[PDB]
Amino acid sequence: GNRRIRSVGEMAENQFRVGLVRVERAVKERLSLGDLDTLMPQDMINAKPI
Amino acid sequence: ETLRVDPTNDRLSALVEIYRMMRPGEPPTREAAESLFENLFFSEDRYDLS
Amino acid sequence: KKRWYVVQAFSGFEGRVATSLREHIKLHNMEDLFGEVMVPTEEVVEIRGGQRRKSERKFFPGYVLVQMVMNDASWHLVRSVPRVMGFIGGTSDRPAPISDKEVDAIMNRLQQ
DNA sequence: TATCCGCTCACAATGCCACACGCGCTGCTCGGCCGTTATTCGCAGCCC
RNA sequence: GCGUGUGGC
């Protein structure tokens, strides 16, 4: 009862969050200076590192 | 006994003391001590009790 | 006084450190408290090849340093940004700047 | 000022054997080179 | 060259 089991989905979600925090840092340091009418929300995020 | 062994008895010195306990020195004047103490446990970003 | 405090960041990305710090100061509109990030670290010397004159014009020991007045809150701002590998200066956490002779020396280096 | 007492850090975790895989891209930063030294061919001693 | 994973005495 004091020992919890974590399957493939939980670890996958944990790794996805580990990637998502870096993606969030990137998009926040990019949006910190990104103003209006500059780009479409397709280049703010990075699909290759996640 | 836990209180009598506590060298600081107010809230202000307690914050800087616990920050010096956490961070390797670099004590703040009510600027980074309270913020780190609230971010380490009372922040949903770096604390995700499921 | 608008002191010339010295700090070392992550090498190689030192231009990235310069622009990140510049953007951070320009976001918090704290120009009356902080200054420049040593943009003069651009030695135009290069390897000038034939038929291709692409010149990066970058040669300096790095060490992105910011002209700043000593304050605890300002220190926390400049350490909250990434690339704070080393906040050099003889101290616990509150250093001292360098005299104006080295400022004139680096001004000469920029002149060259 | 001495005598232990308490907090902190280095150091150890068989021995082997077998199989498999896995070791990232891009923006600053630094040093620095001649067609007379190194490549290639003509010639001859020595073994088969 | 090591690391990781797995198995065996």
Side-chain angles (χ1 to χ4, degrees), chain C residues 12 14 16 58-61:
Chain C
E14 279 156 337
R16 274 71 74 187
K58 292 164 184 168
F59 170 74
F60 211 70

Coordinates of all heavy atoms in Angstrom, one line a residue, chain C residues 12 14 16 58-61, chain D residues 26-32:
Chain C
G12 N 31.3 30.7 -25.1 CA 30.7 30.3 -26.4 C 29.4 30.9 -26.7 O 29.2 31.4 -27.8
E14 N 28.4 33.6 -25.4 CA 28.6 34.9 -24.7 C 27.8 36.0 -25.4 O 27.3 36.9 -24.7 CB 30.1 35.3 -24.5 CG 30.7 34.5 -23.4 CD 32.2 34.4 -23.5 OE1 32.7 34.4 -24.7 OE2 33.0 34.3 -22.5
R16 N 25.0 35.4 -27.0 CA 23.7 35.0 -26.5 C 23.4 35.6 -25.1 O 22.3 36.0 -24.8 CB 23.4 33.5 -26.6 CG 23.0 33.0 -27.9 CD 24.1 33.1 -29.0 NE 25.1 32.0 -28.8 CZ 26.3 32.0 -29.4 NH1 26.5 32.9 -30.4 NH2 27.1 31.0 -29.2
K58 N 34.9 38.7 -34.7 CA 34.7 38.4 -33.3 C 35.9 37.8 -32.7 O 36.3 36.7 -33.1 CB 33.5 37.4 -33.1 CG 32.1 38.0 -33.5 CD 31.1 36.9 -33.7 CE 29.8 37.6 -34.1 NZ 28.8 36.5 -34.6
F59 N 36.6 38.5 -31.8 CA 37.8 38.0 -31.2 C 38.0 38.7 -29.8 O 38.5 39.9 -29.8 CB 39.0 38.2 -32.1 CG 40.3 37.9 -31.4 CD1 40.7 36.6 -31.2 CD2 41.2 38.9 -31.1 CE1 42.0 36.3 -30.6 CE2 42.4 38.7 -30.5 CZ 42.8 37.4 -30.2
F60 N 37.7 38.0 -28.7 CA 37.9 38.6 -27.4 C 37.8 37.5 -26.4 O 37.0 36.5 -26.6 CB 36.8 39.7 -27.1 CG 37.3 40.8 -26.2 CD1 38.3 41.7 -26.7 CD2 36.9 40.9 -25.0 CE1 38.8 42.7 -25.9 CE2 37.3 41.9 -24.1 CZ 38.3 42.8 -24.6
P61 N 38.5 37.6 -25.2 CA 38.4 36.6 -24.2 C 37.0 36.4 -23.6 O 36.8 35.5 -22.7 CB 39.4 37.1 -23.1 CG 39.6 38.6 -23.4 CD 39.5 38.6 -24.9
Chain D
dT26 P 22.6 22.7 -37.5 OP1 21.4 22.9 -38.3 OP2 23.8 22.1 -38.1 O5' 23.0 24.0 -36.7 C5' 22.0 24.6 -35.9 C4' 22.6 25.7 -35.1 O4' 23.6 25.1 -34.1 C3' 23.4 26.8 -35.8 O3' 23.2 28.1 -35.3 C2' 24.9 26.3 -35.6 C1' 24.8 25.8 -34.2 N1 25.9 24.9 -33.8 C2 26.5 25.0 -32.6 O2 26.3 25.9 -31.8 N3 27.5 24.1 -32.4 C4 27.9 23.0 -33.2 O4 28.8 22.3 -32.9 C5 27.2 23.0 -34.5 C7 27.6 21.9 -35.5 C6 26.2 23.9 -34.7
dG27 P 23.1 29.4 -36.3 OP1 21.6 29.7 -36.4 OP2 23.9 29.1 -37.5 O5' 23.8 30.5 -35.4 C5' 23.2 31.0 -34.2 C4' 24.3 31.3 -33.2 O4' 25.0 30.1 -32.8 C3' 25.4 32.3 -33.7 O3' 25.4 33.5 -33.0 C2' 26.7 31.5 -33.6 C1' 26.4 30.4 -32.6 N9 27.1 29.2 -32.9 C8 27.1 28.4 -34.1 N7 27.9 27.4 -34.1 C5 28.6 27.6 -32.9 C6 29.6 26.8 -32.3 O6 30.2 25.8 -32.8 N1 30.1 27.3 -31.1 C2 29.6 28.4 -30.5 N2 30.1 28.7 -29.3 N3 28.6 29.1 -31.0 C4 28.1 28.7 -32.2
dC28 P 26.6 34.6 -33.1 OP1 26.0 35.9 -32.9 OP2 27.3 34.3 -34.4 O5' 27.6 34.2 -31.9 C5' 28.6 35.1 -31.6 C4' 29.4 34.6 -30.3 O4' 29.4 33.2 -30.3 C3' 30.8 35.1 -30.2 O3' 31.1 35.2 -28.8 C2' 31.6 33.9 -30.8 C1' 30.8 32.7 -30.5 N1 30.8 31.7 -31.5 C2 31.8 30.7 -31.4 O2 32.5 30.7 -30.5 N3 31.9 29.7 -32.4 C4 31.0 29.8 -33.5 N4 31.1 28.9 -34.4 C5 30.0 30.8 -33.6 C6 30.0 31.7 -32.6
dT29 P 32.5 36.0 -28.4 OP1 32.4 36.3 -27.0 OP2 32.6 37.2 -29.4 O5' 33.7 35.0 -28.7 C5' 33.8 33.9 -27.9 C4' 35.2 33.2 -28.2 O4' 35.0 32.2 -29.2 C3' 36.3 34.1 -28.6 O3' 37.5 33.7 -28.0 C2' 36.4 33.8 -30.1 C1' 36.1 32.3 -30.1 N1 35.6 31.9 -31.5 C2 36.1 30.7 -32.0 O2 37.1 30.1 -31.5 N3 35.6 30.4 -33.2 C4 34.6 31.0 -33.9 O4 34.1 30.6 -35.0 C5 34.0 32.1 -33.3 C7 32.9 32.9 -33.9 C6 34.5 32.5 -32.1
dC30 P 38.9 34.6 -28.1 OP1 39.4 34.8 -26.7 OP2 38.6 35.8 -29.0 O5' 39.9 33.6 -28.8 C5' 40.3 32.4 -28.2 C4' 41.3 31.7 -29.1 O4' 40.7 31.1 -30.2 C3' 42.4 32.6 -29.6 O3' 43.6 31.8 -29.7 C2' 41.9 32.9 -31.1 C1' 41.2 31.6 -31.4 N1 40.1 31.8 -32.4 C2 40.0 31.0 -33.5 O2 40.8 30.1 -33.7 N3 38.9 31.2 -34.4 C4 38.1 32.2 -34.2 N4 37.1 32.3 -35.0 C5 38.2 33.0 -33.0 C6 39.2 32.8 -32.2
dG31 P 45.0 32.6 -29.8 OP1 45.8 32.3 -28.6 OP2 44.8 34.0 -30.1 O5' 45.7 31.9 -31.1 C5' 45.9 30.5 -31.1 C4' 46.3 30.1 -32.5 O4' 45.1 30.0 -33.4 C3' 47.3 31.0 -33.2 O3' 48.2 30.2 -34.0 C2' 46.4 31.8 -34.1 C1' 45.3 30.9 -34.5 N9 44.0 31.5 -34.8 C8 43.5 32.6 -34.0 N7 42.3 33.0 -34.5 C5 42.1 32.2 -35.6 C6 41.0 32.1 -36.5 O6 40.0 32.8 -36.5 N1 41.2 31.2 -37.5 C2 42.3 30.3 -37.6 N2 42.2 29.5 -38.6 N3 43.3 30.3 -36.8 C4 43.1 31.3 -35.8
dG32 P 49.7 30.6 -34.2 OP1 50.6 29.6 -33.6 OP2 49.8 32.0 -33.7 O5' 49.9 30.6 -35.8 C5' 49.4 29.6 -36.6 C4' 48.4 30.1 -37.6 O4' 47.5 31.1 -37.0 C3' 49.0 30.7 -38.8 O3' 48.4 30.3 -40.0 C2' 48.9 32.2 -38.6 C1' 47.6 32.3 -37.8 N9 47.5 33.4 -36.9 C8 48.5 34.0 -36.1 N7 48.2 35.0 -35.4 C5 46.8 35.1 -35.7 C6 45.9 36.0 -35.2 O6 46.1 37.0 -34.3 N1 44.6 35.8 -35.7 C2 44.3 34.9 -36.6 N2 43.0 34.8 -37.0 N3 45.1 34.0 -37.1 C4 46.4 34.2 -36.6

